[PDB]
C-alpha cells in the first residue's frame, strides 16, 4: 500500500524521517531529486518572492528570509530540484 508526502512545513530539521527506521512494518521508502538549473531555480524562487511580496508586509518571514535565500542561490550554496517521496508498505493481507 503506497503513500505520499504533499505538505511540508517551516522546517527541514535534520533526519526528520528517522521515525520510519524503527518501524514494525516492512516497506520501501523512495525519493527523487531532479537537480535543476540555476536560472530555473532562481525563477522559481523569484516567483515565490513575487507572490509573497504581493501581500501585507510580514515583518521577517517576508523580506529578509527570501533576501538571503536568493543571495545564497546566486552565491552558489544550494541547488534546487524536483522531489517526491513515496513510502510503500508491504504486507500479507489488505487489512494489515
Amino acid at each position: 500500500g503506497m503513500l505520499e508526502i504533499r505538505e511540508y512545513d517551516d522546517a527541514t530539521e535534520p533526519g526528520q524521517l528517522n521515525v520510519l527506521l524503527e518501524s514494525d512494518y516492512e516497506f520501501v521508502l523512495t525519493h527523487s531529486f531532479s537537480v535543476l538549473s540555476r536560472p530555473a531555480a532562481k525563477e522559481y524562487l523569484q516567483r515565490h518572492q513575487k507572490n509573497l511580496i504581493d501581500a501585507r508586509d510580514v515583518a521577517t518571514d517576508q523580506i529578509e528570509e527570501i533576501d538571503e535565500a536568493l543571495n545564497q542561490l546566486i552565491s552558489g550554496h544550494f541547488v534546487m530540484g524536483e522531489h517526491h517521496c513515496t513510502l510503500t508498505v508491504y504486507g500479507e493481507t489488505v487489512q494489515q
Binding site: 511540508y8 533526519g15 509573497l52 527570501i66
Partner: protein, 104 residues
C-alpha cells in the same frame, strides 16, 4: 524515541514549492486543454459558446489553488489505470510479466 529534532536552526524551506507556472493562477497545460475543448465546442455546435470558458476556468482556478497538482494525478490515472483493458477479468488491473508482444 527522539532522533534529532529542531531548535529553530532547521534549514529554511520556502513555499515556492509547486507554485507551478500559472497564468491567471492556472497552469498552462490544463488551461490549454480547456482552450482546445471549448474551441472544439465553438467550432462544432455554435459560436456563442466561448461563454463556456469563464465557468469552468473559474472552477479550475479554485481547484488548482486548493490542491496545486490535481491535474497531473488526473492525467496519470487516465493514462494508466483507465487504459488497461482487462480490469474486469482479473478483478484488478494487471500487467503480464512475460513479454507477450503478440509475436508468435
Amino acid at each position: 524515541m527522539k532522533p534529532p529534532q529542531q531548535q529553530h536552526e532547521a534549514f529554511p524551506l520556502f513555499k515556492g514549492a509547486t507554485r507551478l507556472p500559472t497564468i491567471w493562477g492556472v497552469p498552462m497545460i490544463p488551461l490549454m486543454a480547456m482552450v482546445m475543448g471549448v474551441a472544439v465546442i465553438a467550432l462544432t455546435v455554435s459560436i456563442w459558446w466561448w461563454a463556456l470558458v469563464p465557468p469552468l476556468w473559474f472552477i479550475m482556478a479554485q481547484i488548482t489553488k486548493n490542491d496545486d497538482k490535481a491535474f497531473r494525478i488526473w492525467w496519470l490515472w487516465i493514462d494508466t489505470k483507465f487504459r488497461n483493458r482487462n480490469k474486469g477479468f482479473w478483478g484488478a488491473s494487471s500487467y503480464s510479466p512475460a513479454n507477450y508482444r503478440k509475436r508468435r
